C-alpha cells in the first residue's frame, strides 16, 4: 500500500512523515536516527491519540515495532 502493508502501520507512517517532514524510510528504520526526538514523540503522540504515548516511541522505535505494541 502507500509506503506500509496495514492500517496500523500506515496511520503511523503518515504521522512519521509529517512530523520528520520528509519520506525517505521504511517500516524497519529506527525514528531517532530518521530525525526523531522528544519533541517530535509528542508530536507523534497528540497527532495519533490514544493509545500511543511518547514513552512507547523509546520502547519502540519502527513502524513494524510501534504497530505490534499497539495491537495488543
Same mark, same amino acid.
Given at each position: 500500500?502507500?509506503? *506500509?502493508?496495514?492500517?496500523?502501520?500506515?496511520?503511523?507512517?503518515?504521522?512519521?512523515?509529517?512530523? !520528520? $517532514?520528509?519520506? @525517505?524510510?521504511?517500516? !524497519?528504520? +529506527?525514528?531517532?536516527?530518521?530525525? $526523531? +526526538? *522528544?519533541? %517530535?514523540?509528542?508530536?507523534?503522540? @497528540? %497527532?495519533?491519540?490514544?493509545?500511543?504515548?511518547?514513552?512507547?516511541?523509546?520502547?519502540?522505535?519502527?513502524?513494524?515495532?510501534? @504497530?505490534?505494541? !499497539?495491537?495488543?
Amino acid at each position: 500500500g502507500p509506503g *506500509s502493508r496495514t492500517p496500523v502501520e500506515l496511520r503511523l507512517t503518515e504521522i512519521f512523515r509529517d512530523v !520528520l $517532514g520528509h519520506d @525517505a524510510f521504511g517500516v !524497519l528504520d +529506527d525514528f531517532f536516527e530518521l530525525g $526523531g +526526538d *522528544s519533541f %517530535k514523540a509528542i508530536r507523534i503522540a @497528540a %497527532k495519533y491519540g490514544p493509545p500511543l504515548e511518547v514513552t512507547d516511541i523509546y520502547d519502540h522505535p519502527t513502524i513494524e515495532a510501534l @504497530a505490534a505494541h !499497539l495491537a495488543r
